[PDB]
Each structure stands twice: as C-alpha cells, then as structure tokens.
C-alpha cells in the first residue's frame, strides 16, 4: 500500500521537475552579462554600539530606521538610538536564552523569544514609563526561532518544532497553524504586502504560505543543507536564502525555481544572515568566517567585504530607509556601516 | 534650538542611568557560573537535580559561588541548532548511564559531536557516570552486555595507577575504568581547542556531586586564567 503512495509521490516529483525544466528558458546570469558592474563598494563603520556584555543573536530596525533593538544571551533587550549612540531602553528578560527579537511597525511593541518556548511582548509606551510584559504567548513545543510582527495585533512565530503559528495578542490564542515542514523552522520573512511569507527550515527546503487561508502554495528545494537565513527581494516576487553550503540562492515565486547562485570557492563557512539593499541591486550576507560580504544581486560578483567583526556575524539588518547596514556579532558589538563618496 | 538641547540632555541622562544599571548587572553576570546539564536520556538527571516547559533552572550556591544549572526539558531530539546557544557556559555536565538500544554507544556519539563542534570546542565537559550499582549487579549477575557490546573489553586490563575500591569486584572496577577510558580516548583524540574533560564516577547519592562540580569549575576557571596569562 505504501509502495503505491511512494511511487505516486515520486512521479509527481518527476512531473514537477519536468515542468520546471520546460519553463527554464534562459539564465539571469546570461541576461545580466551586458550590464555595467556595480564596482567597488567601500563602506566604513560609522558607529559602534558597545553596551551588550554577551553575544548577540538578533537585532531589528524600526520603521523610522532610527531605533534598533538588540537581544543578547545575558538577558538584556537594549533599544539603541543609531544617530546619537545613546540607549533608550533596557528590558531585563525572564529567560536568559533568547534567539530572536522583533521591533513592531508601530514602534510600540517589542517581541522576544528563545529556548523558553514562549514569546514575550513588551509595550514600550506605558503611562508609568516602565516596560512590562504585555502578553505571554505559549503553545509552541520547541524553542522559538524567529518572530515577526505582521501587525500590532498578530505576530507570526516560527519554532523549533516543525510548525509555524499565527497568533492574536489581544486574546493570546493561535489563529492559524502552518504545518508541513520536516525540520526546525530556522528563519522567516514576511512579504512587503504582508500577504505571504516564506519559512526556511532545516530540511533544506523553503515554503510559501498565505496567512489569510493558511496552507503552503509552493516549495523551493534548491539548497542542499540547513537554511539559516531568508529575505524577500524588495519587489516581493523573489527571495534569497543562505544555507550551510556557503551559497546564497535567488529564487523566484512566479518562475517557481532558482535563478542564480552566489557560491564562491574561497568561502567554506555557513551563511548566518542575508539582507537586500533598498533597490535590490546589492545582497549583503553575513558569514561564519567573521566577514560579511556584498554581492551583485544580478551578476554574483563580490562587490565588497565588510570585515571588522571579531566573532561570527550572527545578525544583519538594512534600514527601511536604506542608508545604513547594522551588523551584530558574537563579540557583543553592533556596528553601523555606511558608504561615503 | 533649546528644545533639541533639552531632548539631548534627557537622552544623555537616560543613557547614564541605563549604563549604571548595566554596570551593576555586569558584576553579577561575571560572578555567577553557568552549567548546562546535558544528560543522554534517562541516566540519572532526575536524581541529580533532586540532590542539587522548555528549560529549567536550579539556583544552587556553594561557598559563596553562584551556579546556574540549565536542564533542556521540552526541546526536541534535534540538538544541532539550539546547542550553539550554550557555547558561553563554563562547563557542560554530561550524564551517562553506565548500565531501547545500546545507550553507551549513543552517549559516545553524542559526546564526540559535542567535543568536535566548532563552537563548543572552547567549552569543557564534566562527565558523571551514574548507575554504578546497576553496573555492579549487571556484572555480578553474568549478563552479556559489555563483553559483547564492546569487543575490545576482552583484551583490557585495569590500569595500575588507579585502584581505590575498598572491596568492590575487580570485574566491576575494570568495567568502570574501561568506560572511563573510552570517554577519555574520545576526549584526547582531538586537541583542537582549549577544553578539558573531567570524568567522575557518581555512585553514592550523598552530597558529594556538588563538591565535585565545584572543584571542576574551580579547575576550569584557573586553567582559563592561566592560559590567558600564557603561563599554562
């Protein structure tokens, strides 16, 4: 009985492969050959944020692209001011182990989660001027990998167990669950329109979910190892995925297959974080070889290198405005990079 | 303007207060000691926690030294992703049942993965080999477990340096030292990093495991400091 099901699944997979091969008409690298190279990208560190006293796993930028919140294993959640280097808030966490944080689009709430298997939400705007846990979200079985505010009232959380959930803060109960993954759901990135989001798991595959209905639409099995980072292209019709192969790969939703690979021979370490520039021409990608890299998103030529971190680069962010690029690391230092002419 | 000056002054005052709090908490953070109690299945973790929803904490302090013991309870079996979270701890208390399938081989394959992880290679490991009595009656009962689950037990002799048992069975002490030697050969095969292993034989349920942990942590800290001063 199971043999028939396995044969059917195999022949659907073969049909999908044949359809993708037939749809494969040209190559983005071939098309982009006749375009002017980006050139040398010189960016120097403008600010160093040196308040944390333990390694940083997460940072996030505000919508205004001025405030950034950073989390560390020492049970602190410090909210910086990038321009003046001052610290605005410092929230002592109940659990020392937090692997993620998220700054709400409204600027009112901040999320945080980790090995406690719960997501804590702090409302920064209080009458007494003190930050306190507004809500505790429990129901995930494994650790909490990533959490992104889809709104001020609903947050998507990707947990260690093979399950993503869409919550509702005003009531605290899950609204929709996203089952179908096989391994740890390491990362998660929302679409620009908050209509879709991709989740990169540890089974070397990525899915595309729609929050309103709640089922996967497409799958992208291009990689060959754990997927640690994921990021939508600014168009909202493509995304890049970092894995432990040291290769970023640009996928396309409409084409439903890869576009072009960002591998390099000199790179052996795994990819930890991935982000795009505002225009989508650049592709910053933090590595485990202590150095962040800048790629030409259309030609896969290394434009520049963001060397300067003592330990591995765990988190990488590009401002919504697009000016600066913050890179946290495991040496407990945040650095705000920028370019000058 | 004057308003922006007032805003900047308020921001500097808030920064000063937050920095004061951070400095005050830094001493506590640097004073406390973090341990990750990582047992390979049901090997005595319950009784070890007795004598001293995702993760657990047991704040026990000994000789004005504060200790954190983290027990990973509700996490999945997939350990390769959240174990990088614990490369800043001082030591990894590892618990092995020395008695479904062969548990000792699973313990060894977890131990060498922990040893050879590129982020955990700077972290020391402390071994507790529980179920000493269980191994004792298993050996005395003529049960074919070790002599056929490890073919190399036949050509093994108890080392001449260590024999502290008062009246225990020589076969039992040979089994104990064989298991300890297996873990020690795993530990000593690779000297890639700057970490050490402290194997212990947890037999009595008395308040001696806490003393062993305290002495091991003292040794770990002393080695780390002497290495940082390039003396060791």
């Amino acid at each position: 009985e199971l043999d028939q099901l396995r044969q059917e699944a195999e022949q659907l997979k073969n049909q999908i492969r044949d359809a993708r091969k037939a749809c494969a008409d040209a190559t983005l690298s071939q098309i982009t050959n006749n375009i002017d190279p980006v050139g040398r990208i010189q960016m120097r560190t403008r600010r160093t944020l040196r308040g944390h006293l333990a390694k940083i796993y997460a940072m996030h930028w505000g919508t205004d692209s001025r405030l950034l919140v950073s989390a560390s294993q020492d049970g602190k959640l410090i909210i910086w001011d990038s321009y003046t280097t001052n610290k605005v808030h410092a929230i002592p966490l109940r659990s020392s182990w937090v692997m993620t944080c998220a700054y709400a689009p409204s600027g009112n709430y901040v999320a945080c989660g980790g090995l406690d298997n719960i997501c804590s939400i702090y409302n920064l705007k209080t009458r007494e001027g003190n930050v306190r846990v507004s809500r505790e979200l429990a129901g995930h079985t494994g650790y909490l990998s990533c959490c992104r505010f889809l709104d001020d009232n609903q947050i998507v959380t990707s947990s260690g167990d093979t399950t993503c959930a869409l919550w509702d803060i005003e009531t605290g109960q899950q609204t929709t669950t996203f089952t179908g993954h096989t391994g740890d759901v390491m990362s998660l990135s929302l679409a620009p329109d908050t209509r879709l989001f991709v989740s990169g798991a540890c089974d070397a595959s990525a899915k595309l979910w729609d929050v309103r209905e709640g089922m996967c639409r497409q799958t992208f099995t291009g990689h060959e190892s754990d997927i640690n980072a994921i990021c939508f292209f600014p168009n909202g019709n493509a995304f890049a995925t970092g894995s432990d192969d040291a290769t970023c790969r640009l996928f396309d939703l409409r084409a439903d297959q890869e576009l072009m690979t960002y591998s390099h021979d000199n790179i052996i370490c795994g990819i930890t974080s991935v982000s795009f520039s505002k225009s989508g021409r650049l592709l910053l990608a933090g590595y485990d070889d202590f150095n962040c890299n800048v790629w030409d998103a259309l030609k896969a030529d290394r434009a520049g290198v963001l060397a300067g971190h003592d330990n591995r680069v765990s988190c990488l962010g590009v401002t919504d405005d697009g000016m600066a690029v913050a890179t946290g690391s495991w040496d407990s230092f945040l650095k705000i990079w920028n370019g000058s002419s | 303007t004057e308003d922006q000056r007032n805003e900047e002054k308020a921001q500097r005052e808030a920064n000063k207060k937050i920095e004061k709090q951070l400095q005050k908490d830094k001493q506590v953070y640097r004073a406390t000691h973090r341990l990750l109690l990582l047992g390979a299945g049901e090997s005595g973790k319950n009784t070890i926690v007795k004598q001293m929803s995702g993760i657990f904490e047991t704040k026990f302090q000994v000789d004005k030294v504060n200790f954190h013991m983290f027990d990973v309870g509700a996490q999945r079996d997939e350990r390769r992703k959240w174990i990088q979270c614990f490369n800043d701890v001082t030591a990894i208390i590892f618990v092995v049942a020395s008695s479904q399938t062969n548990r000792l081989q699973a313990a060894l394959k977890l131990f060498d993965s922990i040893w050879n992880n590129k982020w955990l290679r700077d972290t020391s490991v402390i071994l507790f080999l529980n179920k000493q009595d269980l191994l004792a009656e298993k050996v005395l009962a003529g049960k074919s477990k070790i002599e056929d689950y490890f073919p190399e037990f036949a050509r093994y002799t108890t080392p001449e340096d260590a024999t502290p048992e008062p009246g225990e069975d020589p076969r039992v002490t040979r089994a104990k030292y064989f298991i300890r030697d297996e873990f020690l050969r795993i530990s000593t095969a690779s000297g890639d990093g700057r970490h050490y292993c402290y194997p212990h034989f947890t037999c009595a349920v008395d308040t001696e495991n806490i003393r062993r942990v305290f002495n091991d942590c003292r040794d770990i800290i002393q080695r780390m400091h002497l290495r940082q001063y390039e003396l060791l």
Partner: nanobody, 127 residues
Framework: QVQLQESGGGLVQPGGSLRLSCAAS????????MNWVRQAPGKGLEWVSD????????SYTGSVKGRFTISRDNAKNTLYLQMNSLKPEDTAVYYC?????????????????????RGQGTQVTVS
C-alpha cells in the same frame, strides 16, 4: 532534493553475505560525511557505521567490527556497506544517513526519529 535511495537487502540465512548500496543525487558527495543507521523492528534507531569525507576515518558500533565493511566512491556518488556473517539479531531496517553540514568532522542529529537527510528503508532479515 537530496534523494538518498538505497538498494540491496532481503532474506539470507545466518552467516551469509549481503551488500547494501546508497545512491545520492542531490549534493556534492565529497563534502559530506556519510554514515549508516539501522533500526530494529521493536527497538529504536542505532548508529552502525560511518566514513569520513575522503575515506580515512572509519568507525563501527561494536559487535559489527570486522564483519561489516563500509566504503565510498566519490566518482559515482555512491556509498557502500559490505556486511558479512549475519545473525538473526541483525534483522533490522537500514538507512543511509548524511551529516547535516559539510567540512565538519562532527554531525549531531543522525540517530533521530525525524531526520531530514536520511534515505528510505532497506529491509534486511535473517532466518
């Protein structure tokens, strides 16, 4: 994507011979440490063997040393297990797992109920 599919297996008298092969068609074979895993009908998963990136460091689970031989061929992207002198205790389901990351001598989660980079079953019985 990885698509690890194994061959061989079946019925054999005790003390007989059998050969198991592993087919990998989704990654670079020469970068990953490939290891075999077997699961008894009633017991849990049990690590049985392994082999290094090049084929230098080889280890066995005990009670199978000598009678089991593991070798890899990077040219054809195939992993082998030459297994000899079987006993009824060898009856199990054999899986061809793969360590999650390349160029690492350590790989954590191979003997787990829900691994992602291991193949399907390969029935082996002895009677």
């Amino acid at each position: 994507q990885v698509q690890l599919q194994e061959s061989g297996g079946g019925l054999v008298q005790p003390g007989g011979s059998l050969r198991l092969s592993c087919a990998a068609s989704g990654f670079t074979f020469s970068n990953y440490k490939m290891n075999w895993v077997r699961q008894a009908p009633g017991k849990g998963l049990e690590w049985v063997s392994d082999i290094s990136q090049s084929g230098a460091s080889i280890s066995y689970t005990g009670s199978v040393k000598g009678r089991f031989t593991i070798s890899r061929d990077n040219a054809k992207n195939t992993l082998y297990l030459q297994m000899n002198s079987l006993k009824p205790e060898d009856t199990a389901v054999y899986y061809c797992a793969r360590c999650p990351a390349p160029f690492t001598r350590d790989c954590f989660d191979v003997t787990s109920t829900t691994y992602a980079y291991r193949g399907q079953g390969t029935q082996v019985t002895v009677s």
